[PDB]
Symmetry: C3
Subunit: 36 residues, 3 copies
Amino acid sequence: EWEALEKKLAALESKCQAXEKKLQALEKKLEALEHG
Amino acid sequence: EWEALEKKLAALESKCQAXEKKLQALEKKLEALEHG
Amino acid sequence: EWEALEKKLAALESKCQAXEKKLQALEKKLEALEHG
Ligand SMILES: [Zn+2]
Ligand SMILES: [Zn+2]
Ligand SMILES: [Zn+2]
C-alpha cells in the first residue's frame, strides 16, 4: 500500500545511514594499518 | 509513475542488502590483517 | 507528500551509488595491504 511504501523508504534511509557509519568504522581500522 | 516508484524502491532495497554483504566481506579481510 | 517521497527516493539512490564508490575505494586500499 501507500503507507507500506512510506515505511519501506524510511527503513531504507536508516539502513544507508548505518551503511555510512559502518564504512567509516572500517576505514578507521584500514587507515591504522595503512599508516602503521 | 506509481509502479515505477515501487520497482525503484525494491531495487534500492536489493542494492543496500548487497551493500551490507560486501561490507561484511571486506571486514573479514581487514580483520585478518588486523590480527595477523 | 507524494512529491516529497519521490525526492526522498532519488536522494537515497544517490546515497547508495556513493556507498558503492566508497566501498570500492576502501577495497582498493585493503587489497594493496593484503598483497603487499
Ligand atoms: Zn591512508
Ligand atoms: Zn579486529
Ligand atoms: Zn586480495
